């Protein structure tokens with residue numbers, strides 16, 4: 001449950017991401033994969049990436065980063081009214097990709113890390129609070145769908 005002012009902060013922060021969705025998406029995934037190498041194993045199409053240099057050079061990783069952040073941005077712009085947008089992602093990530101909710105926590109924190117890394121001094125405490133709450137809401141609603149599906 002975010003206030004109007006918190007959603008305003010979220011969407012203000014998101015404008016930073018939308019200016020360079022592929023660069024943000026790439027860095028989010030690289031942060032996820034390098035911080036939590038087990039997550040790489042969930043991607044048949046990225047498990048060949050042995051080094052961060054290879055990850056950085058991967059155009060397909062940037063492409064997927066764009067897909068991920070485009071989806072997330074579409075969800076965030078719903079300001080919590082995202083059941084229709086979230087449902088297929090929860091279902092695909094539980095049933096097809098088999099992504100534990102822990103990895104969604106990892107990527108949520110990776111987003112925060114990337115925002116500070118790319119916008120140092122420009123991702124204020126209020127913005128971090130609002131973005132964190134929005135990612136918690138996202139993760140929590142996914143978690144509810146995971147529970148429905150019995151997925152761990």
Ligand code: HEM
Nearest residue numbers: 039042043045067068071072088089092097099103104107
């Ligand atoms: C912000 C959180 C995430 C968003 C918005 C997101 C979004 C997406 C989207 C839109 C797709 C393609 C459509 C689909 O298959 O449903 C996808 C595919 C996929 N996602 Fe995610 N995802 C997120 C987090 C994760 C995490 C944390 C993992 C694993 C650690 C993961 C693993 C995968 C895999 C393996 C695929 C299939 C990739 C392929 O083979 O093309 N996702 N994701």
